[PDB]
Amino acid sequence: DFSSIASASSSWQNQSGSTMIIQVDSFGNVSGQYVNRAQGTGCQNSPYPLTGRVNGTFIAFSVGWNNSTENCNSATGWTGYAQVNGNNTEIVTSWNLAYEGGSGPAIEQGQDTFQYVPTTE
Amino acid sequence: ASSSWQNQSGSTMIIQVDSFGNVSGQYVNRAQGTGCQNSPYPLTGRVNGTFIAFSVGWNNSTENCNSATGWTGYAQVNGNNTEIVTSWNLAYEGGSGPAIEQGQDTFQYVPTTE
Numbered sequence: 001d002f003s004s005i006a007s008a009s010s011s012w013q014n015q016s017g018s019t020m021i022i023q024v025d026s027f028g029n030v031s032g033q034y035v036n037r038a039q040g041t042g043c044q045n046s047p048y049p050l051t052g053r054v055n056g057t058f059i060a061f062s063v064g065w066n067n068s069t070e071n072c073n074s075a076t077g078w079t080g081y082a083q084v085n086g087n088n089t090e091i092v093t094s095w096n097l098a099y100e101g102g103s104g105p106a107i108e109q110g111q112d113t114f115q116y117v118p119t120t121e
Numbered sequence: 122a123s124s125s126w127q128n129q130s131g132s133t134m135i136i137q138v139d140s141f142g143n144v145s146g147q148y149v150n151r152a153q154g155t156g157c158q159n160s161p162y163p164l165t166g167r168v169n170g171t172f173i174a175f176s177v178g179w180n181n182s183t184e185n186c187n188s189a190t191g192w193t194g195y196a197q198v199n200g201n202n203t204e205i206v207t208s209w210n211l212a213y214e215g216g217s218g219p220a221i222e223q224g225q226d227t228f229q230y231v232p233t234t235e
């Protein structure tokens with residue numbers, strides 16, 4: 001359960017190198033900070049707030065791509081589930097990125113799997 | 122600040138945008154064939170200019186669908202109409218195990234809930 005995650009910060013990285021730090025409360029809110037490091041994308045290396053909801057093993061969270069350091073005129077939402085892989089827990093997700101193309105507004109699809117990262121010294 | 126929306130499926134939401142770009146409200150699901158219909162669910166999200174993403178976990182203690190959905194899109198001003206064009210994913214327990222369904226919703230701006 002994402003309850004296991006409650007009342008503590010926990011960190012998570014995806015295969016494109018992005019990290020998020022997330023707080024899950026007992027009310028099922030998700031708060032955190034999202035550092036994007038995926039190539040081909042604006043808004044990298046700078047923390048973006050994030051908010052979402054957890055229900056048991058499922059989660060969905062949201063980021064708007066403005067934090068005052070960089071604005072990419074866009075937003076992303078992710079939806080997925082926690083699962084145990086080997087003996088790591090990860091979060092499997094599909095995501096959409098809504099942004100301003102030059103042909104017009106577009107919405108790009110993709111997938112991201114986040115691995116739990118324990119705190120390091 | 123506060124506004125109501127209905128999508129092609131008859132589903133309804135109310136959203137407040139605060140001074141930090143947070144979205145808050147509730148979502149009432151009316152899409153045929155789905156769980157968790159006709160019952161308020163918490164909604165949270167973020168906005169950025171004309172773009173937005175929001176999230177719901179389908180759990181309220183009246184009905185838990187073991188389930189969560191995220192939407193991402195943009196508002197556009199279609200004359201008298203304002204719309205939110207979205208794509209969504211719904212992650213849920215399927216028969217094989219956990220799974221993720223894709224779909225799309227256009228939300229029409231509701232002036233005064235008719």
Ligand SMILES: O=C(O)CCCC[C@@H]1SC[C@@H]2NC(=O)N[C@@H]21
Pocket residue numbers: 014016018035036037038040041042043065072073074076095097099110112
């Ligand atoms: O380029 C932008 O408009 C904002 C950054 C985009 C980041 C996307 S969102 C989904 C995918 N997962 C990531 O960690 N980064 C990309």
Ligand SMILES: O=C(O)CCCC[C@@H]1SC[C@@H]2NC(=O)N[C@@H]21
Pocket residue numbers: 128130132133150151152155156157179186187188189190209211213224226
């Ligand atoms: O059946 C469930 O697991 C909960 C109901 C989910 C309703 C989906 S979410 C996306 C689409 N838009 C809606 O207003 N309803 C469906």
